[PDB]
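dumping the sequnces here before i forget
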Amino acid sequence: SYYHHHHHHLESTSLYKKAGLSKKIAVLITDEFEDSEFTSPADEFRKAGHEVITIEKQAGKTVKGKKGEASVTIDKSIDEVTPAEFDALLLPGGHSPDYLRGDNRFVTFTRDFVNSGKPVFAICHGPQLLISADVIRGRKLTAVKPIIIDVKNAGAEFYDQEVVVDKDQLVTSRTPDDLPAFNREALRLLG
Amino acid sequence: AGLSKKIAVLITDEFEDSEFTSPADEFRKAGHEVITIEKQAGKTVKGKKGEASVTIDKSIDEVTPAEFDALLLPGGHSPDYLRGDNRFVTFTRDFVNSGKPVFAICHGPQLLISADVIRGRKLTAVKPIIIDVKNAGAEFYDQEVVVDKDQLVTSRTPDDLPAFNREALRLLG
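..and the predicted 3d for all of it:
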């Protein structure tokens, strides 16, 4: 369903807002991302007191979900952020990963973030960026049907499960129907 | 006019408009028969840019690679949708193994990856999937058009269409 002006930052009523000490979840996201693959995790993270930083190519830009149900404002350009400043990384699916994996900046960000050991949450097509960063050979994960073959070709050990957690870092799921489990493990690693 | 040949086309919604219409136009001008295949005959699928509309001629369940002379695989998001269904993957695998000409452009090669019939074959593809084509064992080349063993014709983007169509027509003749 349509989600009117979704917001992903701590509300002006948050007690954690002023001190600015919240954990930060980076999100590589562009047009045609799977709507709920952003709004659901984002809403859970926000309710948990974590901040969400959307990253694309132009700060202030508005990107729209594949279903047109959600539109989100981009907080930062990938040129002005570093994997270092974030605690975790979210990679929503839809056609967003396809658009982003053709840009070395996002692939490098994903690679460096993964190599930092920090938690990464990738759902549906999201893993495509992990493939491009080439950091999943020998690691356990799942993904949406059409790319299962690509994940395997990338040397990863595929599992058909609602959620897969590798070394308490990589959290992957298959579809929006796995969101409950996806969010559970993501939150767990953030706590 | 040479011997007319039936060209199968695996296509669904959100395909890259010109990646179907340009080759189709060129193929028809040469007297060839273009046959579109999806899940349900009679359906109308539209291109990613809402410019091209395509009536589906056949259901993947009612056709065999044997009845066609060649296969066209347009890009866009169509291959992503199709490669999630064994029927189209099997059709692609079987078609390639038959030795008949296959023309795949932009994202089109994704169905070839899924069919797992490109290890050791030369080809090109759109930027975002280069790593996937390489992981599949293919020998990647960044050229406007790549023809492997006079069968597999691949191109990167719509701007490569002239070369793409040229080689496809060449193999059809």
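The helical segments of chain B are 17-29, 78-82, 86-97, 110-115, 130-135, 161-172.
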